[PDB]
Subunit: 114 residues, 3 copies
């Protein structure tokens, strides 16, 4: 699984250990081993949500399976929780796009996951 | 809707007001309320289009519905128009990927739109 | 086709000529003319792969067709090869998401490719 967060919150507001916390929590939520979890945080972005430049985040979670109605609700509660607690971003200023990737459409280690 | 623009045009070439203009115009073109429109502009990128480093843009528009052949033509005319007029990027050096997101696959406010 | 790579490798480690090499090699692998190939490299990123911050890359390849099981294996070999040789990123620390785009869902030059 891969999780990306783009945000206008400044780099100095991202706590040390945030990458690790995301890795651990997503391993738990997805059921996948942490060795397969990739995380990417992009602060200091030039962005707006609803026309406002108050703190916000635009995110993606890609995973081979483990994506669906109930699961995505649960991921959204988890991830909005983390972004609120760690980055002080209001859950109503967060979008998370979920992608259920076909194994054949993810490249890794000179091949695909198919 | 979420609109992202990545470009090699420098930050100082992005005019004041550009994110608001995007937000306003996308609300109009998509029919969605401005409060749901998120925009993200990433200047100073290391990129090429057709092997050339002349001004270019790689973009995405994600929306829950309002995505289709005619609509996407109309978005492309609008957005290429804005990138040409405001960032001086030629329309033929612009790619926009469109995504019609399932409501279940967009997280917001601790839940999804499902 | 459009190829984007996000990496924690620093900008000074990206060799001269790298965007052209990507452009050329992807033209060859996809069969599409280089004039239609767009590439984007984003260094100095804050990211982790499998809980660690050694060199890694999170990437996407979007193409109108030319996406599938065998082709994607071949792209992954090529692109992991280039990232290893040029950026010294281990292939096992690289994910590449592949997207087969509908022509109607790609904007270019005030319209779509449909």
């Amino acid at each position: 699984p891969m999780f990306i967060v783009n945000t206008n919150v400044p780099r100095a507001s991202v706590p040390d250990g945030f990458l690790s916390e995301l890795t651990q929590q997503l391993a738990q939520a997805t059921g996948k081993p942490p060795q397969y979890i990739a995380v990417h945080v992009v602060p200091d972005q030039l962005m707006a949500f609803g026309g406002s430049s108050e703190p916000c985040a635009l995110c993606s979670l890609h995973s081979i399976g483990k994506i669906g109605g109930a699961q995505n609700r649960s991921y959204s509660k988890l991830l909005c929780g983390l972004l609120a607690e760690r980055l002080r971003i209001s859950p109503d200023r967060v979008y998370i796009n979920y992608y259920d990737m076909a194994a054949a459409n993810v490249g890794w280690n000179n091949s695909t996951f198919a």
